[PDB]
Amino acid sequence: GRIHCRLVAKKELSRDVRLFRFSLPSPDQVLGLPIGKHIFVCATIEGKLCMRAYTPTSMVDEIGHFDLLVKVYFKNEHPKFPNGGLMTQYLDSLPVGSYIDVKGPLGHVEYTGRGSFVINGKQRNARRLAMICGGSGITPMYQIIQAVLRDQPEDHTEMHLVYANRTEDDILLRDELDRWAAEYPDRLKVWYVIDQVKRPEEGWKYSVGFVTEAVLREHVPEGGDDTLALACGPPPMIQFAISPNLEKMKYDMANSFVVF
Numbered sequence: 001g002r003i004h005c006r007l008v009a010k011k012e013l014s015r016d017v018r019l020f021r022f023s024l025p026s027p028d029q030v031l032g033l034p035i036g037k038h039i040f041v042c043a044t045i046e047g048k049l050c051m052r053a054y055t056p057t058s059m060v061d062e063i064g065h066f067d068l069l070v071k072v073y074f075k076n077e078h079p080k081f082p083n084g085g086l087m088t089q090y091l092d093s094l095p096v097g098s099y100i101d102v103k104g105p106l107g108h109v110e111y112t113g114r115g116s117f118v119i120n121g122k123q124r125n126a127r128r129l130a131m132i133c134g135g136s137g138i139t140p141m142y143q144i145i146q147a148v149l150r151d152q153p154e155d156h157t158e159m160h161l162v163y164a165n166r167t168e169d170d171i172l173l174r175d176e177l178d179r180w181a182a183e184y185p186d187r188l189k190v191w192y193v194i195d196q197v198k199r200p201e202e203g204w205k206y207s208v209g210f211v212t213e214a215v216l217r218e219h220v221p222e223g224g225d226d227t228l229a230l231a232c233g234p235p236p237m238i239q240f241a242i243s244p245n246l247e248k249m250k251y252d253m254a255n256s257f258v259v260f
């Protein structure tokens with residue numbers, strides 16, 4: 001349930017990317033966040049208590065603190081969202097030493113073990129996972145990815161990740177993903193897509209643009225049953241760019257398609 005965490009440290013991974021390390025009040029504990037679930041960092045900004053979901057990037061076994069990879073939505077940055085992000089600017093504003101209120105565990109998805117899943121109460125299993133995401137929608141996915149690989153080589157669940165962004169300077173857990181991809185070729189397949197190539201000179205070898213059926217066709221596995229699909233991305237993307245294409249790839253939308 002509710003827990004009071006102090007912001008122990010902050011890290012600027014890039015102009016708009018921070019890594020915040022929060023301490024739990026009892027230094028001998030882990031944040032027992034079951035895989036597939038998130039926490040709410042609650043805070044009262046101005047006059048309302050804001051509630052935002054975040055899925056930590058730290059090991060399930062991390063004693064004493066948990067980390068959040070937060071993509072800061074600054075103001076004076078977007079045509080349509082001129083005043084930036086609420087909670088993200090609030091957290092970026094916090095000086096280290098400050099207190100935060102985490103509510104958890106929330107969620108409907110849980111990765112109980114080996115291919116096994118617990119969605120909205122029901123229990124299921126999968127052998128091939130189709131993880132399609134965009135931006136920070138990667139953290140929920142990176143939690144399962146870390147779980148499966150941790151349970152290696154017994155939990156040999158097959159993962160196919162399609163990670164979409166806008167720039168190569170925007171791929172979040174890149175090195176981590178590249179690093180794993182090299183180690184567990186059999187387990188995880190990684191494919192990036194990017195709206196633009198900031199430094200094409202260096203030679204971008206993945207897809208350029210948006211998520212297309214041609215991309216899903218060659219990077220997500222075949223639909224059917226025993227092939228689960230999980231997706232966490234902005235509304236329009238889940239919308240236009242994903243569900244129809246996966247429908248076209250014969251994935252039962254109901255019993256086989258989930259969004260975080």
Ligand SMILES: Cc1cc2nc3c(=O)[nH]c(=O)nc-3n(C[C@H](O)[C@H](O)[C@H](O)COP(=O)(O)OP(=O)(O)OC[C@H]3O[C@@H](n4cnc5c(N)ncnc54)[C@H](O)[C@@H]3O)c2cc1C
Binds near residue numbers: 139
């Ligand atoms: C399961 C789950 C896990 C999540 N995990 C994480 C996580 O691990 N890490 C993480 O960082 N995020 C995560 N999120 C995202 C989180 O829900 C927030 O919505 C995100 O923090 C932004 O919140 P905010 O209060 O700053 O924005 P809000 O004030 O709610 O506004 C968001 C909207 O404004 C737009 N916007 C405003 N300014 C800009 C700008 N400068 N550039 C681009 N768009 C702009 C955004 O595009 C978005 O459409 C997760 C969400 C869920 C559902």
